[PDB]
Amino acid sequence: GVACADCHMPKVQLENGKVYTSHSQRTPRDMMGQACLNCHAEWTEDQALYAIDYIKNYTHGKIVKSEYWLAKMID
Amino acid sequence: NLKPVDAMQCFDCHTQIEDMHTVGKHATVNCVHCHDATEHVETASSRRMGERPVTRMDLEACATCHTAQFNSFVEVRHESHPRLEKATPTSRSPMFDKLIAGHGFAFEHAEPRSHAFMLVDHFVVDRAYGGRFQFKNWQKVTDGMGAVRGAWTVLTDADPESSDQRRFLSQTATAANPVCLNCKTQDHILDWAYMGDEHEAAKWSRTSEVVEFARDLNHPLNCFMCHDPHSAGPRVVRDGLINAVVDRGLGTYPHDPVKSEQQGMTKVTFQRGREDFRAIGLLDTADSNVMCAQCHVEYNCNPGYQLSDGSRVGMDDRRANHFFWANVFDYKEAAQEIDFFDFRHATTGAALPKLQHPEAETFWGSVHERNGVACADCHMPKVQLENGKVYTSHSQRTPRDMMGQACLNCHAEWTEDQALYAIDYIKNYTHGKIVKSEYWLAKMIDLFPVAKRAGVSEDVLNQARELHYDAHLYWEWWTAENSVGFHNPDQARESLMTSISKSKEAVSLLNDAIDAQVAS
Amino acid sequence: NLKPVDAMQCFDCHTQIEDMHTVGKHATVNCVHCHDATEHVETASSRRMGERPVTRMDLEACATCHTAQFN
Amino acid sequence: NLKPVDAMQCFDCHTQIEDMHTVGKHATVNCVHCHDATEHVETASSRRMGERPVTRMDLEACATCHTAQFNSFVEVRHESHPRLEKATPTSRSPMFDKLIAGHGFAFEHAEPRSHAFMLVDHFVVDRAYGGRFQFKNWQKVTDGMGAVRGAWTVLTDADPESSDQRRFLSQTATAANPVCLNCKTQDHILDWAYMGDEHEAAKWSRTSEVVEFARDLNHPLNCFMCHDPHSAGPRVVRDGLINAVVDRGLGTYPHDPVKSEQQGMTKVTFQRGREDFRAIGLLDTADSNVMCAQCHVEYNCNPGYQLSDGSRVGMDDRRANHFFWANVFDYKEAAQEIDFFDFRHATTGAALPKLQHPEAETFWGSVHERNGVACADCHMPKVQLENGKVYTSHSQRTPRDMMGQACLNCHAEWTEDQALYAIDYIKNYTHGKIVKSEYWLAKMIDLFPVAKRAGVSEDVLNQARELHYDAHLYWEWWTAENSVGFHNPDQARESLMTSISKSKEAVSLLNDAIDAQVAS
Ligand code: HEC
Ligand code: HEC
Ligand code: HEC
Ligand code: HEC
Ligand code: HEC
Ligand code: HEC
Ligand code: HEC
Ligand code: HEC
Ligand code: HEC
Ligand code: HEC
Ligand code: HEC
Ligand code: HEC
Ligand code: HEC
Ligand code: HEC
Ligand SMILES: [Ca+2]
Ligand SMILES: [Ca+2]
């Protein structure tokens, strides 16, 4: 039941104030407290960032190998 | 969901509001945002109110369309230390207890904190309601948003079944009275006659039971204190200020008739039946100096005594709600004009004045004021954004937190460290002279018991008491004023040197008299 | 300074808009905030547009009441 | 390399140790880690010690298997300012010299610093040994690890050839006595009888030469003060605490019989021949409130006088080692029960009590204590690790350094800045009332010489001296206590207002009496 806004345009957190919805649609790296760690209480910011990077590093590896094999065929 | 009402129908009986609403930047804002008038409209005539319509005084009535201004206002500055007593060696007045003995401030006088807390802090300080009111627990002291929502959401009353002012703990006082509240809230703006005079249409007045009045009030610093809700234009609502500037003809800048004319005020009066009831002051310009002067002034808001014969002046007297609208060098004359003083010193017996936060009257004539600078320029500047719509910060706080926007934009010749160093030069020099003024006041005060016990004459003691009035005035102005000299450094210097001069004259007088009695 | 128009006059021909506007959280927001329709009202019929009204598409039309979301 | 001994052989004569060692989490830890008993075993019988075996009291005996707990304990908090005198305008008690005149604390009373230094700081403070002991040079003041290794590795004695207490510099005192050391070290745990009573098997007692005793002691806060070395289970070893809780039947929580029963203590006694000698108190739970109460309490550890007739109470009397185990409102009654006071004020002549660091007795009844919170939760929390084996921090320090683990885990509604602001509200308010209490005490004290010289009667002066006892008690409790109100803010408030009330009553009494003598 999670949606794009939960990670990319979360509610602002304020010590004292009227809450509103951030309209800065951007990577959760800039707002990890609101976009990630409120749900994932078991993690620190560095741990959550490490989990993102594990996926991105593995996927990019396979994109590069896919391109190597496509290029070999094309040639 | 709000449903709009027929404003044209309202205007068939409300021509005064029509002329303001239809012309300003709130012409498209429907009455339903701030009034529930359904039963009123069913029962009223042009000459009979019928059912009383409800008017919203909560700040959220504005925050719906003006969130940025609301959020910047309610922010709590945690570096503004809370509940910090001024009568301590590390704060503003190390010898305050000796010097103020006989006044209610001896029971407690803390430094200011953020605006969100003004109403709740008024209710809980030890000198105000005998300790009747407390926060619900010690955690609630952090809750600025809660305070704004309503004082009674965060506070408790020790005895809901009684309405008298009394002590609930031993070292408290009951200094609070209805006039105080006019600089904490304007929730009562439709239930209080101009100056708090008695009036058939007023629920509350100068002579009301302040505990009953307190329970009817909720919100701090209403947004409409500086902004008319109907025209959206700049104004003041504080009665005592309108009385000084307009009724007494002193002007917005008493020392500058030209500036007074260019940046003036127009008094607008509202009636109940055919009798005048309340008033506001529309400003010619969006002048923060006069907006902030609704509260950041020296005032009377309390009973006292007459200088002429020593008789009591009670809350029923118009002098119990008074803006002196005078600088430190004109104050004694201003107090003589209304034949008034605040208290008799517990040790010396002198009639003395009580001074409070005179920022507005101090700023007059300073280099910044003479160059057209105003409170807002240093304390609520425009926000600077790389990409965005500009608005005015409503977080009214020290410029130390925003030096780029509140200082260095004007002073391009300085780095932030240099500007801070210039501030500190003034504050350090001024504080040194406050501490020396207190040393000499204390030395004089301590001689009074010695002189009395030595048999010094009442004529000599009265001469010394006359010097004490001046020695006190020219010192306390500066512990009362919040800038530690920054708003007017040359004036602070001249005043504090005058205080020390007066104390020294009294010390010499008394020492000579004691020595003469010993010799005899 | 904006001056409000009579929405009821618009609603006579614009029932779909009436049904949406009167029910939601913009029921108090006047048409003048986003439309200039004076000549339109003078020339339209129930089925023909007449002179075309101006409609504001700029984001600042929302920014005066919703600055935080705009910024 | 250590070589294990036959524990079963030891147990043939040591059944008491067997029953503790074989059951707890030290069942596999061999005696050789802490005892050298080779000659003992060759010469002993079940009824004759033979050669005395050596027992290790150094903390490194535990650090070998428990490095993390040792290192967190010995860490020095450099932000805990060292050798900082409390009797100064910027510290805890700006008027302490006037108020404490007649007591040894006038010579020096610094703020606390890290636990590693407790024994060395006791030895070098100006009020303790007449300046006999110093660090070897001013560089050694930084060396926490060295202090833990042994006091005499970092200190020098001005005269190794004499053992009397005397002044080596003019503005020092000789307040130290053997009872003090029980809250600095337990190196003497096998050489001191319960309460320090005289005993044939005790090398040291209440009446020993404290300079000779000092030279036999080395380590601060031994690890076994809270942990039995044989069972590894939770305990206390401090005699005065066991006496209050068990012997006098007051319980671990005197204000809560149920909590006292659930979180109780069992006294275990060890004999020398057939005579009782020493004792410990095994705890039902690992209760840090009671562990920390071995030292963070108000106590007697000094000679004094009787309230009844003014006669001397010397170190030989059991009252020279006493835990009152009473809150501020029960203390006067507790002192009357043992017919005791500490000193006569140098100016007023009043019999007065001397109060010291009553954190444990202050915490009772506070909102945190009533909700089951304990000292450790705020001052030595569990460590939080992304990946690792959890242990308990032994760096017993302010929660300001670890707000995430010592505050915000419970208070999820707050940011760190908000929690700090709540602490500061309490401390600022409490400090203001301490400063005002001192102002009024000082005003009263200064009237005593005036009254005496005016010929005021002894009956009036004695009435004033009775008020001084209470005015002092209800003030000094809070300068002595280290939280500046945080541990119990409502109690501090009620107490300080009582002090001011008492001082004011005395000031009025004396002023009226002086005025009457002048009039006559
Ligand atoms: C949290 C569970 C997420 C959900 C829900 C959505 N997105 Fe996402 N997105 C997420 C991460 C961790 C990342 C990588 C960010 C990084 O800095 O490594 C992304 C990435 C994007 C991007 C690229 C952003 C950039 O590179 O700056 C886009 C444009 C994006 N995501 C879009 C998007 C949409 C449309 C979503 C709803 C269908 C959506 N995201 C959900 C995390 C999460
Ligand atoms: C889709 C890509 C959007 C664009 C374009 C705009 N907004 Fe938005 N808005 C969006 C979401 C997902 C939400 C939160 C809805 C929820 O309930 O979770 C919002 C919310 C608002 C609100 C309501 C108050 C608040 O929650 O902040 C307002 C007043 C609002 N949005 C205004 C606004 C403005 C002025 C925009 C142009 C700058 C804008 N929105 C664009 C999604 C989207
Ligand atoms: C003529 C039939 C009226 C109509 C239509 C409306 N109002 Fe009215 N109003 C009317 C009178 C005679 C009075 C009292 C004036 C006096 O002599 O005291 C009022 C008063 C108000 C008030 C102030 C109430 C108070 O607290 O003192 C308000 C806020 C107000 N009226 C609002 C209002 C609205 C919003 C209307 C249209 C929805 C409206 N009024 C119509 C007479 C008449
Ligand atoms: C939406 C329904 C609004 C409510 C509720 C409030 N205000 Fe307002 N305000 C609104 C608009 C559309 C505008 C004009 C914007 C523009 O720049 O064109 C305003 C303007 C103001 C101003 C500026 C006035 C000027 O410079 O002349 C102020 C000071 C102001 N509004 C204050 C204000 C107050 C105090 C409110 C609560 C009583 C309030 N507004 C409510 C929209 C809406
Ligand atoms: C407007 C002319 C005011 C009147 C009338 C009263 N107060 Fe006031 N108050 C005013 C200002 C501008 C400030 C901030 C600047 C400062 O020097 O404090 C305050 C502050 C307070 C405080 C908080 C600080 C403190 O002294 O502890 C309290 C508790 C307070 N004010 C109480 C109070 C009482 C009891 C009044 C009637 C006797 C009263 N205020 C009137 C402005 C004005
Ligand atoms: C006097 C002490 C004020 C209080 C109370 C409120 N505001 Fe204000 N506001 C004030 C000043 C000095 C200014 C700038 C005037 C200038 O042109 O220099 C403003 C401005 C606004 C505006 C206009 C847009 C902007 O400049 O930001 C709005 C919409 C506004 N203020 C709203 C507002 C709200 C919602 C308030 C209650 C939280 C509020 N104001 C109080 C001074 C004062
Ligand atoms: C009947 C005489 C009408 C009146 C009264 C109003 N409008 Fe209208 N409008 C009308 C028609 C027949 C049409 C064409 C579409 C249709 O529904 O058949 C329109 C169109 C518009 C539009 C769209 C313009 C575009 O560029 O496509 C707008 C924005 C609009 N109308 C606004 C509007 C307003 C604000 C009115 C009251 C001031 C109003 N209309 C009155 C017919 C009629
Ligand atoms: C002042 C004259 C407004 C204009 C211009 C715009 N909006 Fe608005 N909006 C306004 C109000 C008074 C409210 C109700 C606030 C409340 O909480 O009751 C709103 C509400 C919204 C919302 C929230 C809707 C919901 O949750 O159901 C949104 C998303 C919104 N407004 C968007 C929006 C857009 C996109 C605008 C430009 C076309 C716009 N608003 C202008 C006041 C005013
Ligand atoms: C019977 C022959 C014994 C053997 C075997 C062991 N111990 Fe012993 N021990 C014995 C006696 C009679 C006493 C004295 C009791 C008394 O009445 O005072 C002791 C004492 C100790 C002590 C305490 C010494 C002190 O400082 O007071 C210790 C620490 C101790 N013994 C240790 C110990 C160890 C480790 C043994 C096995 C290696 C051992 N003892 C054997 C009698 C006997
Ligand atoms: C190794 C030879 C050890 C020496 C020397 C000391 N301790 Fe120990 N301790 C050791 C072990 C293997 C264990 C059990 C670990 C486990 O969790 O299973 C312990 C345990 C403790 C405890 C915890 C006891 C409990 O929770 O019941 C404490 C408080 C403790 N140890 C303290 C302690 C002291 C004070 C020491 C010096 C006198 C000491 N230990 C030495 C291993 C070893
Ligand atoms: C346990 C009941 C104690 C007795 C017996 C003695 N002291 Fe103490 N001491 C104790 C604590 C809990 C603290 C820290 C808290 C605090 O308020 O300081 C101390 C501290 C000291 C210090 C350092 C601070 C200072 O006052 O300079 C010194 C020098 C000191 N203690 C000396 C001392 C003397 C001379 C004692 C016998 C007369 C004595 N202590 C006994 C706990 C206990
Ligand atoms: C080289 C030119 C040095 C400079 C630079 C600093 N110190 Fe020093 N210090 C130096 C020596 C050779 C000694 C004597 C060592 C010895 O064995 O006796 C010291 C001594 C000190 C002391 C002890 C003073 C005493 O016991 O009276 C202190 C507290 C000390 N030094 C501190 C210190 C500080 C803080 C310095 C930087 C501000 C500093 N020293 C510089 C050599 C040199
Ligand atoms: C009382 C003032 C203590 C002193 C002296 C020592 N420790 Fe401690 N220890 C103490 C507490 C309150 C606790 C936690 C109890 C609980 O369960 O909540 C502990 C715990 C230990 C343990 C157990 C493992 C752990 O929780 O970290 C060990 C092994 C331990 N302590 C060892 C130890 C050492 C080596 C000491 C001297 C440096 C030491 N303790 C002193 C309280 C007290
Ligand atoms: C878990 C073991 C907690 C620790 C750690 C801290 N607090 Fe606490 N606190 C806790 C509870 C359960 C309560 C009572 C809540 C209630 O509903 O009554 C409190 C209360 C406070 C208070 C109010 C005190 C009063 O009104 O007398 C304060 C000011 C407070 N807590 C602050 C606080 C601080 C600053 C802490 C870290 C230094 C801290 N608490 C830790 C539970 C726990
Ligand atoms: Ca005044
Ligand atoms: Ca004591």
Swiss-Prot record, chains B, D:
Residues involved in heme 7 binding: 368, 407, 410-411
GO BP term, example: ammonium ion metabolic process
Residues binding heme 1, per UniProt: 10, 13-14, 40
UniProt entry tagged with the keyword Metal-binding: yes
Temperature-related properties: Optimum temperature is 80 degrees Celsius.
Gene from which the chain derives: nir
A Pfam family recorded for this sequence: Cytochrom_C552
Subunit and interaction comment: Homohexamer. Dimer of trimers.
Known cofactor(s): Ca(2+); heme
CDD domains: NrfA-like
Protein task: Catalyzes the reduction of nitrite to ammonia, consuming six electrons in the process. Has very low activity toward hydroxylamine. Has even lower activity toward sulfite. Sulfite reductase activity is maximal at neutral pH.
Cofactor annotation remark: Binds 1 Ca(2+) ion per monomer.
Protein name: Cytochrome c-552
Reactions mediated catalytically: 6 Fe(III)-[cytochrome c] + NH4(+) + 2 H2O = 6 Fe(II)-[cytochrome c] + nitrite + 8 H(+)
Residue positions binding heme 3: 26, 62, 65-66
Family: Belongs to the cytochrome c-552 family.
Curated annotation (Swiss-Prot), chain C:
Post-translational modification comment from the UniProt entry: Besides, it may lower the pKa of the Tyr hydroxyl group.
Binding site for heme 2: 31, 34-35
UniProt-annotated binding residues for heme 3: 26, 62, 65-66
Annotated residues for binding of heme 1: 10, 13-14, 40
Intracellular or extracellular location(s): Periplasm
Function: Catalyzes the reduction of nitrite to ammonia, consuming six electrons in the process. Has very low activity toward hydroxylamine. Has even lower activity toward sulfite. Sulfite reductase activity is maximal at neutral pH.
Subunit and interaction comment: Homohexamer. Dimer of trimers.
Annotated family: Belongs to the cytochrome c-552 family.
Descriptive protein name: Cytochrome c-552
Gene source species: Thioalkalivibrio nitratireducens (strain DSM 14787 / UNIQEM 213 / ALEN2)
Residues of the full protein shown: 33 to 103 of 553
